[PDB]
Amino acid sequence: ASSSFKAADLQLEMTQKPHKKPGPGEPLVFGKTFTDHMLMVEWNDKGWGQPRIQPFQNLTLHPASSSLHYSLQLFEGMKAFKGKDQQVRLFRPWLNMDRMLRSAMRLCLPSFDKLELLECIRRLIEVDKDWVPDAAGTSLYVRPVLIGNEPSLGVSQPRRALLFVILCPVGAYFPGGSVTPVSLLADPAFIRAWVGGVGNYKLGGNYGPTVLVQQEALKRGCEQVLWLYGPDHQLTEVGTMNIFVYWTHEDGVLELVTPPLNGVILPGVVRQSLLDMAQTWGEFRVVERTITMKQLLRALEEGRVREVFGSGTACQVCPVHRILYKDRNLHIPTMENGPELILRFQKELKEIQYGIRAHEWMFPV
Amino acid sequence: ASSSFKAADLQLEMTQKPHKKPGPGEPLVFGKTFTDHMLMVEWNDKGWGQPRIQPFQNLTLHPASSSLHYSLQLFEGMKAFKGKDQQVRLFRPWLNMDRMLRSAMRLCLPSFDKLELLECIRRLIEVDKDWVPDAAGTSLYVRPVLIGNEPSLGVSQPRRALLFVILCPVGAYFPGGSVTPVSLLADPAFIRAWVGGVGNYKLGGNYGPTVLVQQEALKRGCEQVLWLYGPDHQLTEVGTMNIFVYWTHEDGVLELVTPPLNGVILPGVVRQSLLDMAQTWGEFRVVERTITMKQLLRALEEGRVREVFGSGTACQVCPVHRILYKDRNLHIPTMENGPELILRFQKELKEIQYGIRAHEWMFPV
Ligand SMILES: Cc1ncc(COP(=O)(O)O)c(CN)c1O
Ligand SMILES: Cc1ncc(COP(=O)(O)O)c(CN)c1O
Numbered sequence: 015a016s017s018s019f020k021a022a023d024l025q026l027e028m029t030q031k032p033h034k035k036p037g038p039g040e041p042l043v044f045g046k047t048f049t050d051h052m053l054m055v056e057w058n059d060k061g062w063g064q065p066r067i068q069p070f071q072n073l074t075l076h077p078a079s080s081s082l083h084y085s086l087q088l089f090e091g092m093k094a095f096k097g098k099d100q101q102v103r104l105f106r107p108w109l110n111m112d113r114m115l116r117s118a119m120r121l122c123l124p125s126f127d128k129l130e131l132l133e134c135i136r137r138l139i140e141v142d143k144d145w146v147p148d149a150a151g152t153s154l155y156v157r158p159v160l161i162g163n164e165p166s167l168g169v170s171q172p173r174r175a176l177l178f179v180i181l182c183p184v185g186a187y188f189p190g191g192s193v194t195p196v197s198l199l200a201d202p203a204f205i206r207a208w209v210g211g212v213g214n215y216k217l218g219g220n221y222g223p224t225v226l227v228q229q230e231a232l233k234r235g236c237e238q239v240l241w242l243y244g245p246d247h248q249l250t251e252v253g254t255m256n257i258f259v260y261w262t263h264e265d266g267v268l269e270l271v272t273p274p275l276n277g278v279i280l281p282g283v284v285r286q287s288l289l290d291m292a293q294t295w296g297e298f299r300v301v302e303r304t305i306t307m308k309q310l311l312r313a314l315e316e317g318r319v320r321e322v323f324g325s326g327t328a329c330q331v332c333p334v335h336r337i338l339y340k341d342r343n344l345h346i347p348t349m350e351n352g353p354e355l356i357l358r359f360q361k362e363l364k365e366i367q368y369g370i371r372a373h374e375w376m377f378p379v
Numbered sequence: 380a381s382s383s384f385k386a387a388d389l390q391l392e393m394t395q396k397p398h399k400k401p402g403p404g405e406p407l408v409f410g411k412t413f414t415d416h417m418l419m420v421e422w423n424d425k426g427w428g429q430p431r432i433q434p435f436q437n438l439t440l441h442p443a444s445s446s447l448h449y450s451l452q453l454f455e456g457m458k459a460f461k462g463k464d465q466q467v468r469l470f471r472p473w474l475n476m477d478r479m480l481r482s483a484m485r486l487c488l489p490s491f492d493k494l495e496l497l498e499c500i501r502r503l504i505e506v507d508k509d510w511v512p513d514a515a516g517t518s519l520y521v522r523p524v525l526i527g528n529e530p531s532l533g534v535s536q537p538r539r540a541l542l543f544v545i546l547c548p549v550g551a552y553f554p555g556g557s558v559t560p561v562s563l564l565a566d567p568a569f570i571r572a573w574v575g576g577v578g579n580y581k582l583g584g585n586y587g588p589t590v591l592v593q594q595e596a597l598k599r600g601c602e603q604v605l606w607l608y609g610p611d612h613q614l615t616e617v618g619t620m621n622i623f624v625y626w627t628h629e630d631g632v633l634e635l636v637t638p639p640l641n642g643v644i645l646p647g648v649v650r651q652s653l654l655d656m657a658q659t660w661g662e663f664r665v666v667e668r669t670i671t672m673k674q675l676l677r678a679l680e681e682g683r684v685r686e687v688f689g690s691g692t693a694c695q696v697c698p699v700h701r702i703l704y705k706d707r708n709l710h711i712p713t714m715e716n717g718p719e720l721i722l723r724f725q726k727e728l729k730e731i732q733y734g735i736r737a738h739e740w741m742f743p744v
């Protein structure tokens with residue numbers, strides 16, 4: 015693509031009524047509390063306007079905005095971590111920028127310079143540094159969004175777009191820093207994405223249809239959805255997380271496996287990070303390969319499965335203890351195996367994310 | 380008295396700044412020009428607020444609005460026609476209401492009373508009746524929209540929603556009384572919807588991903604996209620229209636066939652109308668059955684194809700003269716069969732829609 019929008023931006027406008035911050039231990043359900051400022055950048059015929067940090071405020075959109083009629087919208091999700099020493103760091107933000115730009119191109123939305131956006135986010139997080147908690151397992155969620163915005167009903171490439179970023183302080187995913195497993199509903203009737211589709215982009219359209227399915231999972235007594243694909247019932251991803259299986263494969267070899275990027279699953283940043291980390295250790299086979307329900311079943315009977323977990327920004331490494339498939343509950347022995355791999359992954363990530371050990375994956379303040 | 384807003388139209392706020400009506404220079408371009416008023420209804424914990432007809436104005440949305448992060452958005456599209464007798468009438472609006480409510484339920488958005496919405500739309504059109512054109516082949520396009528509007532980043536059932544309707548005066552589908560055919564790009568690389576997905580609901584998320592594909596079609600010299608599905612390359616729908624084929628099938632029996640409502644395609648109101656009409660005549664076989672590229676190819680060279688066309692609100696019966704499949708340009712003999720069936724359908728629909736012959740399909744003013 016081409017380039018635009020930069021570092022030196024159309025200033026800062028600070029809030030006149032800084033909101034009261036969550037209180038120790040009680041507060042924040044995820045995504046309900048927002049900080050004082052936000053980033054906004056407009057794009058049109060004149061190209062990109064100047065970036066701006068402004069008080070958190072509502073958006074003003076023409077009723078025919080393509081963002082609301084034809085889902086010309088994409089978003090990202092990443093976290094900034096504060097380790098007392100009060101230093102704040104973003105976890106591998108570049109991968110989120112790479113992903114956002116790919117999503118933008120898929121929807122014919124305007125390209126932007128990945129590094130300028132990162133610096134702009136850096137400046138915003140800076141203004142709201144104090145919203146960044148520091149208690150154990152807490153963080154600041156960063157939500158960048160790009161939407162089409164042509165006041166036209168034709169389905170077409172917008173000639174106007176808006177980019178914005180808001181922040182949410184977040185509690186520790188696991189109550190008081192424990193770790194609890196989830197149960198998953200695995201029903202083939204449900205299909206999140208298709209080959210040749212857009213499941214590998216973080217487009218809002220991928221999410222809206224899952225609301226009803228997640229409701230079913232709850233009614234069937236499960237907490238999240240394990241999305242299956244194909245006549246083969248391949249495991250693809252779980253909820254808003256990639257899925258991993260640690261077991262002794264059929265050839266007698268102990269491995270950490272996860273579905274490959276074939277176009278149906280989202281290239282998760284945590285997923286890539288767990289692959290990287292495990293390969294680096296070099297203690298067992300690490301591979302990206304298709305996993306089927308049929309293989310999972312035979313593995314569980316022979317006692318070859320050690321741990322199964324989801325990976326994502328919300329819950330970096332999430333153990334799974336049960337899967338309800340075809341009306342029959344499969345017990346997943348994850349917790350009775352430690353869960354050793356999961357705990358090491360969490361510790362390594364904690365040490366890296368909270369600055370206790372230097373690492374190129376972290377981006378300062 | 381129900382958990383639905385009531386045509387208890389929270390007064391009308393007439394406009395204090397009328398827009399200039401499309402000037403004599405007759406340049407009606409689809410969905411670019413809007414009328415003076417709009418309908419707006421808000422929903423929350425207390426339920427549906429009172430319906431309101433207000434001046435056309437921008438929407439005010441919280442930056443975390445679920446409509447913009449997770450595509451909790453759906454819409455409709457229908458037309459009001461003005462006869463020479465000057466009466467305005469809506470074409471089978473009830474089917475659009477049924478479809479809108481189905482879409483709403485799929486996205487866990489609030490249910491509403493179909494008849495109340497229809498009446499509110501009726502009142503809206505009445506206010507802006509002077510915007511309804513009456514030159515040949517013109518009409519008033521009605522765009523109802525329902526969006527989630529929770530100021531929360533959690534992917535979940537919104538607790539706040541907004542329903543609105545805007546109107547667009549529309550020119551003739553290409554202002555030259557004679558139907559011009561379109562060419563379509565048929566490439567299996569692009570997949571719009573899938574079995575078990577949401578292709579049978581009018582959700583904005585279905586459209587965003589087509590923008591890039593429609594650009595390719597142009598880049599390749601075609602005007603619209605014929606969406607294929609399966610290893611079998613089944614014809615599904617074309618652009619924003621259902622597809623029909625009139626030919627002598629493989630049994631030598633003359634017939635009109637269109638893909639069935641298997642969940643992959645949108646149940647078009649015009650489509651259903653053409654089926655009904657053809658059904659009623661009883662002059663030839665009318666069926667809903669799978670159509671494959673292999674069968675079309677084999678028929679185009681067995682010389683059994685008479686006419687192929689798309690059907691939709693924008694272009695009710697649209698002839699097709701060419702399909703580019705695999706670098707292969709297939710000539711479709713539609714126009715040389717002097718769009719006999721297409722012409723008859725156009726003739727009948729015009730007489731019904733413009734009030735020249737009374738019909739239960741039309742809804743007054
Ligand atoms: C469908 C889906 N799959 C996987 C993930 C995990 O991605 P990440 O590690 O980048 O947060 C997410 C969360 N973005 C997701 O929404
Ligand atoms: C994908 C798609 N299919 C079919 C149609 C035709 O539907 P209708 O006849 O109700 O306009 C449309 C236009 N609404 C469409 O967008």
Ligand SMILES: CC(C)C(=O)C(=O)O
Pocket residue numbers: 167168169456586619693
């Ligand atoms: C371009 C218009 C026809 C569209 O978005 C639709 O009707 O679905």
